[PDB]
Structures are given as C-alpha cells and as structure tokens.
Amino acid sequence: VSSGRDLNCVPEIADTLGAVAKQGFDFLCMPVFHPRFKREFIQEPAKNRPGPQTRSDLLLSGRDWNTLIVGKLSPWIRPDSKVEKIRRNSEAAMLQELNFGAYLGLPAFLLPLNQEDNTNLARVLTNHIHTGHHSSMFWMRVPLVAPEDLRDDIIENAPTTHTEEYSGEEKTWMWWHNFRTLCDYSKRIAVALEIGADLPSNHVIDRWLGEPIKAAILPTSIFLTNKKGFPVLSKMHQRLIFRLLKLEVQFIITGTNHHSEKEFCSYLQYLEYLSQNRPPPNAYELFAKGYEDYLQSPLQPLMDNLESQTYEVFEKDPIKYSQYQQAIYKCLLDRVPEEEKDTNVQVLMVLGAGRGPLVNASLRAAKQADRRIKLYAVEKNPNAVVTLENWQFEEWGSQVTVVSSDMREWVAPEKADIIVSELLGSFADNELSPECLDGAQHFLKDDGVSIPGEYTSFLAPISSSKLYNEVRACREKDRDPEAQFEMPYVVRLHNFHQLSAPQPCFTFSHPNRDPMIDNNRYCTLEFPVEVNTVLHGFAGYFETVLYQDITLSIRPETHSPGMFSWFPILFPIKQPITVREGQTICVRFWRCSNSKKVWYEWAVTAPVCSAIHNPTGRSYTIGL
C-alpha cells in the first residue's frame, strides 16, 4: 500500500526524511516554507526582511524532490480573508509557495478547503495552472465532516445542532464541487479526503463516489486501542479503507503518536495489515485490471474488418461459447425427436462465423444432442475466411461449407432450420445485429429458429467527475470541438456512482415476423433519484435470450458469471446536470437510420433540458 507521513514540523529535512523512510513510508507531506514565517510583500520595513526566504533546494537530490515530497501551503495563507491586507499578502504568498514547488519539481502540493468560500483561492490556483505545463498535482484537503460540525458540545450558550440536516451534513462535498467548477474541472486538481473519528451517515460518504480521490488522510486520533495496546480502526472505518483501496488511493498518516507505549510505525503496520487482508479480486476484476475508466471506441465489425488479435480476445471467453453450445444443444432436441435422430439432418447457418468458435460450438452441441447437422459458415471478413477455409480443409471436412459473403447479399442454396450469430455490442444492437439478421431472415425455414431469439438494452444514470474529464480530453483537431460528448464509449466504469436502477431501453426479436419492419426506436425513461448529485452520463448494458432459459447478460444485477466479452457502454452529456434528492431524471433515446448509417440520439428533459446529442449522426454513426 502507498503511504505518506504528514508533518508540520521539519527541523532538518534529511534527518526527518530518513526517520520517515525508516518507519516504512513512501513519501513525506511537509511545509516548503516555515509554517509560522508570515511574510509581508507591500509594507516597509517588514517587506525588506533579509533572506533566505526558506531552505535550499540543494538539501535534497532532484529525484528526492520529484518522488518523496508532497508540498504544503502555509497555514496563515488566507486568500478569501475579509481583511484586504491579509488577502493581498496571501495571494502573493500562495503564488510564491506554488512557484517554489514548481521550481522543486514536486509531484503534488496540498491546499486546504476548510470553509465554504474559496473563490479567490480557486482564482489564484487557476492563474498558477495557466503559467506553464508542470503536470504536477494539486491535492485539495477536504474533510468528510466540517470542523464546525464535529466540535464538542461544551459551549453552554452556543449548543451544537442536534437536528438532522440531510443537505447540510453534505456541506464539504459542496465546498469541493464549487472549487472544481470555478477551476473548470482541471485534471491537475484532485481530492485528499480527511477521515474523522465519527464517520458521517452513508449518504454523506458515497457523495464522494465518482470524485477524483487521490489521497485519504487518517489522523492518529481516530484510531482505537486494542487489548495489546496497539492502534486499530472500528469495523466501519475498516469498510471505508477497503472501498478506498479499490480506488487505489494514497494513504496519509497525520498527527502525533497517541499510542506512546508503541512505536509510531504501528499506525502504518495496521494499515499494511488491512491492505494484505483485503477481500480478493474475482476473474473479471483480474481481467479488467488496467482497463478501469479507460475509454475505447466501440468496435464496428460490419463496417471494419477485425484484426486476428481481436478475434483471439473474443475466443478467450469460454462462458459465452458454452452458453451458445447449450442453447444449440437444447434447440436440436426440440426440433428432432429420438425416432428421427439418424434420418433428420438439421441445416445450421453460423452468420458471422469469424475464425470459427461458433462453428465448433454447433458441432459439439450436435454431438452432445446425438443429432445430425449440416453447417454453413458465413463470413464477410476475407481475412477471417482464410482461417475458416484452412480449418474446413484440415479438420471440419464436407460437413461445413465456408461462405465468403455478407449475410444480407448471400443467395443460399438451402433454407436453414437454425441460424446462429454473435453480432451483439455492449448496447446489444449497436453492431447492427437487427439489420444483418433482417437481411438473412429470408433463408430461414418458416418454423426456423434464430439464436439469439431476442435482446434488450438497458440504461442507468451515472455520476462520475473523472469520466466527464476523460471524455472532455477527447477533443480533436479538425472536427467539431464538442464531438467527443456526442458519441458512446466502451469503458470498464470504475470511479463512478450509479444514480438509479437500470431500465430497459430497446428490444429486438428474431425472426422479425412483422409486415412493417422498422428498426428505428424512441424511448422515454424516468429514473427516480434518492441522493443529491451531478449527472455526467448514462451507462448502457444488455441482456439476450439465446434459447429459452439460456441467456447472456452484462446488466449488473443479472451479469453472466465470469463472462468478460463486453464492458459497459457510456453515453456522455455535454453539460453536467445538478440533481436533488427526490427528483426524477428523465432521458429520451432514439435509434435512427438511413440506407447507409445507423445512430443514436439522446437528450435529458428532466430536472432540466440538455441539447439533443448527436443530431443526424453528425458526430457518431454506425456504417451499414
């Protein structure tokens, strides 16, 4: 676990660093100027105070400044002070300290958010950021519970508020939110969240869910003492540590030793014990590792010819093919009884056969069912057809006929009893499985079966300031400056908050036994929200019925165990939308088309209206 020591007293830098390294800490948060050394910038004689203003950069190597030191703003610096003289000396001192940090090449610098009004602090920080590049982080020190809200009820004529204030208990989140809004969501501004002795109510904690937390500050004072006299944490504090470890935050130990009989390293030893004894990660968490909140363009296997290694990645999912095999096995037994098993040969067409794993799944299914099949393997990608025709000649034989064709253009010699396909995207129909299957429908027998028989997409509103920032950074040269917000992204959503339960969006059935075949759709979804938050977009998932009870799902509540073929999809919004507890999020999604392209259009109509996203597919289309 990555840990740091927070100190406000550094007599000698090399000796302090050395003692802190001996305790097992990876870094030290410390003042870069003496915390009591208030400086005057305007009024004589104090403005002319002889130097040096602080200690020399030569006391540490450049590597040590770059890796072991987190800088700290002096505690007297008050840019939002009501005294003009204090405000102006504070602005000049803030710049001077931030500039010294940049001179040192510090990896991070700590600034407090200890009151509601930090407008001028924000302004001075924004001006500092727009002076060079640096890449250096700014960690905003904000507590879960404000100091005014955790004070002892020991003032006889000014008692503490014994009334529950739902939105008021959430006041420190609003201090952070206003600060980062003023600073225009800078990627360089993150949260150093300070944990208190008494944890606030759940709602107050999970307000921070999709916020960019880079560090968690643990005061030595919040630790309890166990039977042996060592510092430990309450079960609820342990639960919070485990949630923070999932976000890979850096842990900061602040304060003096409150367990005097023990060495100070015991606070860190306990933290390292919790890290070692954390619940282990599943096969999905192990596969998804490195892909957390990493944005990707959804694959378009109809418009583009997929590379060999994309097919190899699809083939690594055994759950998906064992589900397809089980579905084909069940369908073969329902179509051919025991008496006909040796005479009745079922025509099976794999539509979009890729490198052949579905062809092999159909063959294993037929051997399992003890039924006879005749296979056609249809594939438009001529590169995948090389793999197919080599497999056919070497292993499959005459039982499999490889067809190099678009399923919509193919003239079939026979009609199929069963059509098998895997043309599904993360939003089910976003790879144009309805259009492809509609075009192939005519060569399926009247009593013919399509595997999959049905699919349904799902949407859920999400809060994530990190993902909003990631999408924003996708602005490109030579295109609409807001195009990146008008397109979906395949992404393993990590640092986010799901604001309401997923609801069905669009459904498709196969075969499509309707005279007025229209794949266009318009859906209105009403999402009840139970917390105060910010809406940054919509997470999309899907569910499919392969055959009867044999299904595949990426919707979290029904997620197919151990299946990693599809990560969720993200539909962003151009502008974050404030949502109050008790309010309903209303979203409208359209599936649109012409003869050449298919696309999605979307808009929020409640609590406030957004603009219609991706009108006429100006930013994003799916090629037919």
Q: Which amino acids are annotated as binding site for S-adenosyl-L-methionine, given as ranges?
A: 311, 320-321, 379, 406-407
User: Cα 513 to the chain's mean position, in Å?
Assistant: 39
Nearer to a second copy, 8 or 616 (CB): 616
From 75-83, 98-106, 266-274, 378-386, span contacting ligand SFG (CB under 6 A): 378-386
Pairing label, strands 137-143, 503-509 = unpaired
Q: In the set 28, 104, 271, 302, which binds ligand SFG (CB under 6 A)?
A: 302
User: Cα 219 to the chain's mean position, in Å?
Assistant: 29
**In this structure, are residues 513 and 445 in contact, taking their beta carbons and an 8 Å threshold?**
no
**Tokens 């020591």 sit at which residue?**
5
Q: Is 393 in the site for a second copy (CB under 8 A)?
A: yes
From 323-331, 358-366, 462-470, 605-613, span contacting a second copy (CB under 8 A): 605-613
**In this structure, are residues 57 and 102 in contact, taking their beta carbons and an 8 Å threshold?**
no
Q: Is 317 in the site for a second copy (CB under 8 A)?
A: no
Task: Give Cβ neighbours of residue 513 (< 8 Å, ≥ 6 apart).
Answer: none
Nearer to ligand SFG, 196 or 301 (CB): 301
Nearer to ligand SFG, 311 or 564 (CB): 311
Residues found in the chain = 624
Q: In the set 6, 359, 601, 621, which binds a second copy (CB under 8 A)?
A: 601
Q: Is 327 in the site for ligand SFG (CB under 6 A)?
A: no
Asked about 422 being catalytic, the answer comes back as yes
Nearer to ligand SFG, 154 or 411 (CB): 411
Min CB(219)–a second copy separation in Å: 30
Q: Is 39 in the site for ligand SFG (CB under 6 A)?
A: no
Cβ-in-10-Å burial (0-12, 13-18, 19+) of 472 comes to middle
Min CB(314)–ligand SFG separation in Å: 4
494 binds, among a second copy, ligand SFG, none (CB under 5 to 8 A by kind): none
**Dihedrals phi, psi of 157, to nearest 5 degrees:** -105, 10
Pairing label, strands 444-451, 416-421 = parallel
From 152-160, 331-339, 345-353, 516-524, span contacting a second copy (CB under 8 A): 516-524
Nearer to a second copy, 162 or 477 (CB): 477
**In this structure, are residues 521 and 506 in contact, taking their beta carbons and an 8 Å threshold?**
yes
Asked about 261 being catalytic, the answer comes back as no
**Quick one: tokens of 585?**
């999020």
Q: Is 211 in the site for ligand SFG (CB under 6 A)?
A: no
Any bridge partners for residue 552, and if so which? 544
Q: Omega before 52 cis (within 30°)?
A: yes
Q: Is 120 in the site for a second copy (CB under 8 A)?
A: yes
**Quick one: tokens of 231?**
């510092």
Task: Give Cβ neighbours of residue 36 (< 8 Å, ≥ 6 apart).
Answer: 76
Task: Give Cβ neighbours of residue 458 (< 8 Å, ≥ 6 apart).
Answer: 502, 503, 504, 505, 540, 541, 542, 543, 555
353 binds, among ligand SFG, a second copy, none (CB under 5 to 8 A by kind): ligand SFG
Q: Is 603 in the site for a second copy (CB under 8 A)?
A: yes
Residue tagged active-site, from 91, 211, 422, 470: 422
**Tokens 């166990």 sit at which residue?**
226
Nearer to a second copy, 308 or 584 (CB): 308
- CA pair distance 315, 312, nearest whole angstrom: 5
Footprint of ligand SFG (CB under 6 A) = 301-302, 306, 311, 314-315, 352-354, 357-358, 378-381, 384, 406-408, 422-423, 436
Active site residues: 422, 431
